[PDB]
């Protein structure tokens, strides 16, 4: 059971990294702004700074507070 | 002509430049356009060569900075003596040194940290110190806290004096360049007047203060009724009843009947059985002899009275057929470049500190030092790390000299030019020897791992298997064990109990020193040490020799000493600068010193340190498993890293819990360093751009534009955090383990 | 190792080793066809990542299986 | 303990996603490298100019996110 | 390369042999009542049994001392002879 | 009880931990003279532990299996003092700090050399900005409603798409 | 103006080498010039035979005194077979090296100029057929040397100190 769980979880993580890498490759090599004009993909590209900044905030908040609670308990 | 030359009031004492941060450089004096400026302000503050091209001003800055460092060290020492005077159990430890743990630091009761005030003994609670200051003060003859107080007050006075001296020699009377370039006078004064006279003075202290007080202490006299040192100096009959030769009173010294001083100027060797340290009579004779030697040696160079040596003429006269002009032009190098002197002195100081580390455990010079295993381990590890850092710094400053201070016109067909001209052969052969050593040591460890895992213990490299005996080291030990018999007939004992003879010194119920045996494991670990040292030397020497140019970038001198790269061309020029070579040599020195200290710790806990019973049975801290477990990497993982780390991780809820906390925190800092080491700069710059957008949306973006750390700064931060985490992890682990098992 | 030291050190070292091979007797008779070069930057990152991941996976798999099967509990 | 470790898991997921989405959305360009699309997916750097451009490609974002996914699955 | 890099003056080895036999073959009044060369000759005398090393016997120390002395004497003799033709000290 | 947690007043594990800590401190105490300063320190420790455990019991903390207070952060009225009340205090302090920092940045963007004002802080200006953080939420709401809090997207640098 | 033993490579300061006693001593240079690898006029087959003989003969020993069966009664046979297998693998190495490096019908690219400048004939070892002959001779000589070492050590049992 332990081996199966660890196996499929690591496989899933690698697969997710691959999915995001191929999304990046799509944007570089296959994304045409002419045909994708003001659709959902173009709107993601438009407010990407907001997305990245809010991900940064969520990561910072989680890391700070979880690490602080752990160090407090230690 | 050697004369005193100064300039009056060169720099006005004013706070005007305190308000201007980057005043020392033209680039930083404009202002902080970006955040990088702040970091640059701290990275160019002490690079005096970069501030100006004037060597006189650089020399003045260096002199005053040295005065400031001396003041800082005086403050630090005064603090140690103060904490010994008030927040210490020094007198209780004097009454019973074998059962009271030294402690000189007491925490405040604020957040439960008061648990750190452990029961060290003598009716005292505090942090158990491992600096060896208690034993040093015992050797010096200090018996009361009043003496520590007066020493601390004198230390504060000397710190103020050094601070004033720095101010005076920068702002009021600044020496000229001719004064600094008098290297012959400087050597004569630092040999005769600094080392020789200092050794003579310390011999005087020992003769008049340390020997009588310490021999009364060895006799069992309570320190309270031990007469004060000035009573020994004044009432010389009181001193003569301990050593009768004092009744002669300087007559033997001037009649050359020096043998009459054999009472307190001995050449015994070995250890004092009562304290486990060196005999202080031997130490006094040692210091007197080296004082005489240094005072003689300091009369070698010609300053202005004729009679002496011109070092320029000595150097120019040493050349041969295999070299060109030999040591021609090196006098100008070493009298006009501060970085060359810094490189030489750093290398020598690091090697000297390593010698100190090796020699202070084999001959413990202080009473009750060997049996204090925590102090021994701490001193060894501390001085090993200091020496390694200094050696790497010597490499760094040799590279800096090669980049900036090197002048090809005045260096033609000399030794430096010829070394530059066959650097390819040097680095080729050093690379080959590094590969050969790595294979025939670590591959031997891997062979042992594999045969142990395959169930073939007879195919391993051990004492019960194919044996690799260190016959040369064993022969050297045998020779040193028999030195008093034939080779040094005026010696009672050998140089150290580690050579041989079957003698075991056991202060209290512990073991001070005993003959250290060498076998296959010692062969393997010494060859591992050689491998690590040669690889570090390879990295550093390749950085120094190829700092100016290489087949890849023929104009690397124009790029500078501290630059990230030259671009992604030629396949990629990442880390081509000598600074990056120092950056990697820091990692390799870290590995070398780490393995050295691990070997020391395991060997001592396994074969030397232990407890002896009344019958005479000697049991060791680990149990003598180094000979059979150090041959295998799994043995290192299990019997050393896993077995001996049981105490740092179980230290919670006790006075050693701080060691576990810092163990984990150092692990954290190391892991944190990993991302500065692995990541780049564009990624973080773009993340910073997104964060800056977030701030601009709310009109809170700073005018000082946030920038990611430079590439070189990224590497510097990574290596700094890496070394801090690793070294602090080991520090916590050793201290917890050795306080628990000792 | 592949993630910390980046490229230039190894390119200079390989230059030195090429000189050494070309100047050594009985071995300069043997010649390479592809000029030896240090690994590229992207290749170095990928090789270091592969080593890191393989070590991660093997270390944790060994620990997991050994600690769950040594004590069936 | 389950609370703290699930929040650590959320931290790991959020940070790995931050790295991967940042690589995917900055793949076509950024303020440091506005013409990143012409250089492809996996290129070393853009040289030491403009302060330094190490790990400026989206492939380098994937490289940096593999460490975080390994940590999170660990 | 001129094929005479080690300018052959075969008198150097004989002069060094004489100048190292003279100091080593001296009855020193110190702990060594006899001379060290006689010890370095006794060593081989006790070690003439075929197929066996000295095994940490009192032979290695004398060997090392005597041969280091011989090597330094030979090197200094070579340097002294070949520095006169040159102007290293003149 | 809020996830099967007993109150710490009648929690046997909580009392067991009390007893164990007091017993450990007394065992450490037995090796010192009563009049000695270490004895006074250990007795102060014992009093501190006793008052700490009494305070934890008196506020109705929830102890789980064994004695360990557990915090409820779901908004329950009986546990507002664990996260909601200190949480609000934190929000007031953090918003204070951020708001006054933002105000200082605003007030130094109109200066002739703002960077010098950032590396060398105008202490009088900074202090009279800091004094304004007492009523920071009101100012934040006013700026949000008036439109002076958020910059328009047309005046913010963005990278090419 | 001193003697200056060390000189540039053939007097050329701009070639990447030096003239050292290690490089071109009369004894060292004589020794290296007469090694079978450097006897360019001799046929590659005989040079390969000599090289393989020497190498198999020296290779037999380590396998015999360090192999896994060094404590068994088949120690000699095991070591000899290990040496022969290493010789065979190195023969494959030489064959593939010759296949990759040299093409049939091409002239030799080995240096045909001496230090003096005699402009001798190019060495035929650096050719497809030359390397093929060298590899065949090396195989034969390696097997012969392994057999000879095994015969001297075990079949004949000559007295040797360590074996
Ligand atoms: C359905 C699955 C799938 C498919 C069809 C593809 C297909 C492709 N990918 Mg994608 N990818 C996937 C999954 C997939 N990938 C996953 C799961 C990941 C995350 C790890 C990625 C991450 C990824 C990146 C980051 C890139 C690609 C690229 C590519 C393209 C070229 C690949 C190449 O050169 O192969 C050649 C194969 C290799 C180089 C792999 C060599 C072996 C690797 C290093 C692992 C070896 C480990 C170890 C040494 C072996 C075990 C040792 C043992 C002792 C333990 C191709 C279109 C590239 C691309 O499009 O370029 C623009 C590119 O840059 N992929
Ligand atoms: C233990 C190791 C470690 C730690 C703590 C971090 C921490 C962080 N990384 Mg890094 N990282 C690491 C290893 C680590 N990383 C490694 C090995 C890799 C692979 C190369 C990366 C790759 C990586 C990438 C690619 C990214 C991060 C990001 C982040 C942030 C995630 C948010 C977070 O946790 O905020 C909480 C913050 C922390 C946990 C940092 C420590 C805070 C300390 C404890 C507080 C200060 C203490 C004290 C006052 C300082 C004293 C010093 C001195 C003044 C005396 C955070 C700064 C992401 C980021 O920056 O997004 C915002 C991001 O994009 N990291
Ligand atoms: C240089 C080495 C050194 C080191 C590392 C220490 C370290 C320490 N000393 Mg020692 N000490 C030293 C030198 C040193 N001292 C010297 C040279 C003297 C002689 C003057 C002393 C005299 C001394 C005394 C008399 C005491 C200590 C104490 C302490 C401890 C607490 C420090 C403290 O009270 O700060 C507290 C913090 C401050 C003073 C900083 C206040 C200013 C900050 C910035 C806030 C200001 C805010 C606002 C502007 C007002 C600490 C372990 C104390 C101790 O161990 O008690 C058990 C103690 O009582 N030291
Ligand atoms: C006997 C004469 C003498 C003595 C004792 C020293 C001693 C010292 N010199 Mg040297 N020096 C001398 C002559 C002497 N110097 C001469 C003649 C010159 C000119 C050619 C120099 C030029 C020189 C330079 C350029 C530098 C030194 C430095 C140092 C200090 C190195 C730190 C150290 O290990 O000290 C260990 C010992 C102590 C820390 C004890 C405290 C110092 C006491 C008070 C002795 C000071 C002796 C002083 C020279 C006497 C004149 C001062 C007097 C007017 C009050 C050391 C104190 C370096 C340094 O750190 O500068 C501060 C340095 O950079 N010296
Ligand atoms: C710099 C080091 C130093 C200093 C300042 C002194 C100072 C002193 N010594 Mg000491 N002494 C020293 C080193 C030193 N000694 C050393 C190294 C030796 C060993 C050779 C001695 C051996 C020695 C003897 C045997 C005697 C002194 C005596 C004295 C005192 C009178 C002689 C004098 O010049 O004044 C004086 C307190 C005499 C004394 O104590 O008279 C009261 C005395 O009898 N000294
Ligand atoms: C006698 C000792 C000595 C002296 C006088 C100097 C003097 C100098 N060095 Mg050298 N150096 C030394 C030892 C020494 N170094 C050693 C031992 C090393 C090996 C690590 C080096 C490695 C080295 C490099 C690689 C470089 C220098 C540079 C410099 C110049 C300083 C410019 C600068 O940025 O510093 C300002 C001061 C700092 C940057 C120090 C900041 C703090 C450090 C980085 C971390 C502190 C660690 C701390 C202990 C951690 C715990 C506390 C923490 C929790 C708060 C100056 C000429 C630089 C130079 O000349 O550039 C051209 C340069 O590039 N040195
Ligand atoms: C455990 C990790 C590790 C290992 C094994 C190595 C290995 C090596 N490093 Mg690296 N290095 C590392 C971590 C490591 N490094 C890290 C973290 C850093 C960052 C500071 C560096 C930085 C660094 C630099 C800057 C330099 C090296 C150098 C070296 C070499 C040492 C000498 C040599 O080649 O012979 C010894 C080789 C080994 C010990 C490798 C293992 C070989 C084993 C014993 C035998 C296995 C073979 C076996 C038959 C299996 C065959 C496989 C086959 C079936 C495919 C070697 C390639 C130096 C170099 O170039 O060499 C001179 C050099 O200059 N490294
Ligand atoms: C026993 C050993 C010995 C020693 C110490 C010397 C020492 C000396 N010889 Mg002599 N020499 C020796 C053996 C020795 N030689 C022999 C065996 C011969 C062959 C016959 C010669 C033939 C010879 C000639 C022909 C000349 C010398 C000269 C010299 C001087 C030149 C400097 C020198 O060689 O470095 C000695 C180094 C030091 C003294 C300092 C360092 C000491 C150690 C190595 C550290 C020096 C005094 C020359 C000279 O000065 O002429 C007057 C000279 O012309 N020597
Ligand atoms: C996974 C494949 C594999 C296999 C099947 C083997 C098999 C073997 N190895 Mg291992 N080995 C391997 C991989 C492998 N190895 C790898 C990857 C390494 C590097 C880490 C090693 C490193 C290694 C060492 C260091 C040693 C072995 C030895 C041995 C032999 C065990 C002792 C024995 O047979 O008695 C004694 C041996 C014999 C009686 C006969 C050996 C000689 C025969 C004739 C070899 C066949 C030669 C043949 C002409 C060519 C065939 C291959 C060719 C087509 C490439 C055995 C044949 C031991 C040995 O004896 O080496 C020779 C030994 O010391 N191996
Ligand atoms: C085998 C090499 C033994 C070299 C033994 C040796 O020490 O040679 C010493 C050799 C002799 O040169 P001289 O000492 O005569 O040159 C005069 C010196 O005083 C000038 O520094 O020095 C060199 O040629 C450079 C270093 C040799 C290369 C070292 C490689 C190892």
- Count helical runs of chain G: 5
Oligomer: part of a larger assembly
Radius of gyration of chain B: 29 Å
In percent terms, what proportion of residues of chain G is strand? under 5%
Distance between the termini of chain G: 56 Å
Name the overall outline of chain B: globular
SSE order of chain G: EEHHHHH
Structural class, from secondary structure content of chain G?
mainly alpha
Name the bound molecules: chlorophyll A, 1,2-dipalmitoyl-phosphatidyl-glycerole
| Major sheet summary line of chain G | 2 strands, antiparallel
Protein name (chain G): Photosystem I reaction center subunit XI, chloroplastic
Subcellular location (chain G): Membrane
Membrane topology (chain G): Multi-pass membrane protein
Keywords (chain G): Membrane, Photosynthesis, Photosystem I, Transmembrane, Transmembrane helix
Summarize the structure in short.
It is classed as photosynthesis. The entry lists the keywords Lhcb9, PSI, photosynthesis. This is part of a larger assembly, with three copies of chain A, one copy of chain B (742 residues), one copy of chain E (90 residues), one copy of chain F (161 residues) and one copy of chain G (163 residues). With 74 residues, chain A is mainly α.
SSE layout:
The structure is cut from a larger assembly and holds three copies of chain A, one copy of chain B (about 750 residues), one copy of chain E (about 90 residues), one copy of chain F (about 160 residues) and one copy of chain G (about 160 residues).
Chain A: H1 2-29, H2 40-46, H3 48-73
Chain E: H1 11-24, H2 36-46, H3 60-85
Helix pairs in contact in E: 1-3, 2-3
Chain G: E1 7-8, E2 18-19, H1 21-24, H2 26-33, H3 44-66, H4 75-101, H5 128-155
Antiparallel strand pairs in G: 1-2
Helix pairs in contact in G: 3-4, 3-5, 4-5
Bound molecules: chlorophyll A (9 copies) and 1,2-dipalmitoyl-phosphatidyl-glycerole (LHG).
Family (chain D): Belongs to the PsaA/PsaB family.
Organism (chain D): Physcomitrium patens
Protein name (chain D): Photosystem I P700 chlorophyll a apoprotein A2
Description:
This is part of a larger assembly, with three copies of chain A, one copy of chain B (742 residues), one copy of chain E (90 residues), one copy of chain F (161 residues) and one copy of chain G (163 residues). With 74 residues, chain A is mostly helical. Helices cover 82% and strands 0% of the residues of chain A. The radius of gyration of chain B is 29 Å and the shape is globular. Chain B has helices at residues 16-19, 36-43, 48-51, 55-85, 90-95, 133-140, 145-172, 177-180, 183-218, 229-234, 236-240, 251-255, 280-297, 311-316, 330-336, 338-362, 373-405, 415-421, 423-453, 471-481, 483-487, 520-545, 556-559, 578-608, 626-629, 633-642, 646-649, 657-678, 682-697, 711-740; strands at 6-8, 103-105, 118-119, 125-128, 173-175, 610-612, 618-620. Chain B has 742 residues and is mainly α. The longest helix of chain E has 26 residues, at 60-85. Chains A and D meet through helix 1 and helix 3 of A and helix 1 and helix 2 of D. The complex binds chlorophyll A (9 copies) and 1,2-dipalmitoyl-phosphatidyl-glycerole. It is classed as photosynthesis. Keywords: Lhcb9, PSI, photosynthesis. Cryo-EM structure of PpPSI-L.
């Amino acid at each position: 059971q332990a081996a199966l769980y660890t196996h499929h979880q690591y496989i899933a993580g690698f697969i997710m990294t691959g999915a995001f890498a191929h999304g990046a490759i799509f944007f570089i090599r296959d994304y045409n702004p002419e045909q994708n004009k003001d659709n959902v993909l173009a709107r993601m590209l438009e407010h990407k700074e907001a997305i990245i900044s809010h991900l940064s905030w969520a990561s910072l908040f989680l890391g700070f507070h979880t690490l602080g609670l752990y160090v407090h308990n230690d | 002509e050697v004369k005193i030359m100064v300039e009056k009031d060169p720099v006005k004492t004013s706070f005007e430049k305190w308000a201007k941060p980057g005043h020392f450089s033209r680039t930083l004096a404009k202002g902080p356009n970006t955040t990088t400026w702040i970091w640059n302000l701290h990275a160019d503050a002490h690079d005096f060569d970069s501030h100006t091209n004037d060597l006189e001003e650089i020399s003045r800055k260096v002199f005053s900075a040295h005065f400031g460092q001396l003041a800082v060290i005086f403050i630090w020492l005064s603090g140690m003596y103060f904490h010994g005077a008030r927040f210490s159990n020094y007198e209780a430890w004097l009454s019973d040194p074998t059962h009271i743990k030294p402690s000189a630091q007491v925490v405040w009761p604020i957040v439960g940290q008061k648990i750190l005030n452990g029961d060290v003994g003598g009716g005292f609670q505090g942090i158990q110190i491992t600096s060896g200051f208690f034993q040093l003060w015992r050797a010096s003859g200090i018996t009361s806290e009043l003496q520590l107080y007066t020493t601390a007050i004198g230390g504060l006075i000397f710190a103020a004096l050094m601070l004033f001296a720095g101010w005076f020699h920068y702002h009021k009377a600044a020496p000229k360049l001719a004064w600094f370039q008098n290297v012959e006078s400087m050597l004569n004064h630092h040999l005769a007047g600094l080392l020789g006279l200092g050794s003579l003075a310390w011999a005087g202290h020992q003769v008049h203060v340390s020997l009588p007080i310490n021999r009364l202490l060895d006799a069992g006299v309570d320190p309270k009724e031990i007469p004060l040192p000035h009573e020994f100096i004044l009432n010389r009959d009181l001193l003569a009843q301990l050593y009768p030769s004092f009744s002669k009173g300087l007559t033997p010294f001037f009649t050359l009947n020096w043998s009459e001083y054999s009472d307190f100027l001995t050449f015994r060797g070995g250890l004092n059985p009562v304290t486990g340290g060196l005999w202080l009579t031997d130490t006094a004779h040692h210091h007197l002899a080296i004082a005489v030697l240094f005072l003689v040696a300091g009369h070698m160079y010609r300053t202005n009275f004729g009679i002496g040596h011109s070092m320029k003429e000595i150097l120019e006269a040493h050349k041969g057929p295999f070299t060109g002009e030999g040591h021609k032009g090196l006098y100008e190098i070493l009298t006009t470049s501060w970085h060359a002197q810094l490189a030489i002195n750093l290398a020598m100081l690091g090697s000297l500190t390593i010698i100190v580390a090796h020699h202070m455990y084999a001959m413990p010079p202080y009473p009750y030092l060997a049996t204090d295993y925590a102090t021994q381990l701490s001193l060894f590890t501390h001085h090993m790390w200091i020496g390694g850092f200094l050696v790497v710094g010597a490499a760094a400053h040799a590279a800096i000299f090669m980049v900036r201070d090197y002048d090809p016109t005045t260096q033609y067909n000399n030794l430096l030019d010829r070394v530059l001209r066959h650097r390819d052969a040097i680095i080729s052969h050093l690379n080959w020897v590094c590969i050969f050593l790595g294979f025939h040591s670590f591959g031997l460890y891997i062979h042992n791992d594999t045969m142990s895992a395959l169930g073939r213990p007879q195919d391993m490299f051990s004492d019960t298997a194919i044996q690799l005996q260190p016959v040369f080291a064993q022969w050297i030990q045998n020779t040193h064990a028999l030195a008093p018999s034939l080779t040094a007939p005026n010696a009672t004992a050998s140089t150290s109990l580690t050579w041989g003879g079957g003698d075991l010194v056991a202060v209290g119920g512990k073991v001070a020193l005993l003959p250290i045996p060498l076998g296959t494991a010692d062969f393997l670990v010494h060859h591992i040490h050689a491998f690590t040292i040669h690889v570090t030397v390879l990295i550093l020497l390749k950085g120094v020799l190829f700092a100016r140019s290489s087949r890849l970038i023929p104009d690397k001198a124009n790029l500078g000493f501290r630059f990230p790269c030259d671009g992604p061309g030629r396949g990629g020029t990442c880390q081509v600068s000598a600074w990056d070579h120092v950056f990697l040599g820091l990692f390799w020195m870290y590995n070398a010193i780490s393995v050295v200290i691990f070997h020391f710790s395991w060997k001592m806990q396994s074969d030397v340190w232990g407890s002896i019973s009344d019958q005479g049975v000697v049991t060791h801290i680990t149990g003598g498993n180094f000979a059979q477990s150090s041959i295998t990497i799994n043995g290192w993982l299990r019997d050393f890293l896993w077995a001996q780390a049981s105490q740092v991780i179980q230290s919670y809820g006790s006075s050693l819990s701080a060691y576990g906390l810092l163990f984990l925190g150092a692990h954290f800092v190391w892991a944190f360093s990993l991302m500065f080491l692995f990541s780049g700069r564009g990624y973080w710059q773009e993340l910073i751009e997104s964060i800056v957008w977030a701030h601009n949306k709310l009109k809170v973006a700073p005018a000082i534009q946030p920038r990611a750390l430079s590439i070189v700064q990224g590497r510097a931060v990574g290596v700094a955090h890496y070394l801090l985490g690793g070294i602090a992890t080991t520090w916590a682990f050793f201290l917890a383990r050795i306080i628990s098992v000792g | 190792m592949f993630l910390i030291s980046w490229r230039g050190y190894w390119q200079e070292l390989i230059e030195t080793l090429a000189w050494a091979h070309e100047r050594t007797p009985l071995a300069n008779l043997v010649r390479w066809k592809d000029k030896p070069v240090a690994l590229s930057i992207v290749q170095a990152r990928l090789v270091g990542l592969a080593h890191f991941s393989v070590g991660y996976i093997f270390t944790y798999a060994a620990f997991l299986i050994a600690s769950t099967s040594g004590k069936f509990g | 303990g389950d609370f703290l470790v699930h929040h650590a898991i959320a931290l790991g997921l959020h940070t790995t996603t931050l790295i991967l989405v940042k690589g995917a959305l900055d793949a076509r360009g950024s303020k440091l490298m506005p013409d990143k699309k012409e250089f492809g997916y996996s290129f070393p750097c853009d040289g030491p100019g403009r302060g330094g451009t190490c790990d400026i490609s989206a492939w380098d974002a994937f490289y940096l996110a593999v460490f975080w996914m390994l940590n999170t699955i660990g | 390369f001129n094929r005479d890099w080690l300018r052959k003056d075969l008198s150097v080895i004989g002069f060094g042999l004489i100048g190292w036999l003279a100091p080593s073959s001296l009855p020193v009044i110190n702990g060594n009542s006899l001379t060290g060369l006689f010890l370095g000759s006794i060593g081989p005398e006790l070690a003439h049994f075929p197929t066996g090393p000295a095994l940490t016997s009192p032979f290695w120390l004398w060997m090392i001392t005597w041969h280091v002395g011989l090597f330094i004497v030979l090197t200094l003799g070579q340097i002294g002879f070949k520095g006169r033709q040159d102007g290293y000290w003149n | 009880d809020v996830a099967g947690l007993t109150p710490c007043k009648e929690s046997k594990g909580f009392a067991k931990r009390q007893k164990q800590e007091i017993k450990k401190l007394e065992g450490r105490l037995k090796l010192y003279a009563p009049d000695s300063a270490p004895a006074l320190a250990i007795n102060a420790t014992i009093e501190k532990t006793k008052r700490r455990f009494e305070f934890y019991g008196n506020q109705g903390l929830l102890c789980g299996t064994d004695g360990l207070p557990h915090l409820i952060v779901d908004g329950d009225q009986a546990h507002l003092g664990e996260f909601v009340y200190p949480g609000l205090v934190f929000l007031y302090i953090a918003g204070w700090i951020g708001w006054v920092g933002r105000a200082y940045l605003i007030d130094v963007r109109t200066s002739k050399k703002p960077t010098e004002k950032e590396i060398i802080i105008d202490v009088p200006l900074a202090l009279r900005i800091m004094s304004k953080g007492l009523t920071w939420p009101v100012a934040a709401i006013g700026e949000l409603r008036s439109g002076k809090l958020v910059e328009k997207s047309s005046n913010i640098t963005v990278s090419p798409r | 103006e001193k003697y200056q033993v060390i000189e540039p490579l053939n007097g050329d300061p701009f070639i990447g080498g030096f003239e050292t006693p290690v490089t071109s001593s009369p004894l060292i240079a004589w020794y290296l010039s007469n090694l079978p690898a450097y006897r360019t006029a001799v046929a590659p087959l005989l040079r390969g035979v000599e090289i393989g003989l020497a190498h198999g003969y020296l290779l037999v020993g380590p396998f015999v005194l360090a192999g896994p069966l060094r404590n068994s009664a088949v120690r000699g046979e095991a070591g000899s077979l290990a040496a022969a297998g290493l010789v065979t693998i190195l023969t494959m190495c030489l064959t593939i090296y010759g296949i990759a490096s040299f093409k049939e019908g091409e002239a030799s690219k080995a240096p045909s100029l001496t230090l003096t400048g005699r402009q001798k004939e190019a060495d035929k070892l650096q050719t497809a057929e030359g390397w093929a002959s060298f590899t065949g001779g090396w195989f034969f000589g390696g097997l012969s040397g392994v057999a000879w070492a095994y015969f001297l050590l075990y079949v004949i049992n000559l007295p040797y100190p360590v074996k």
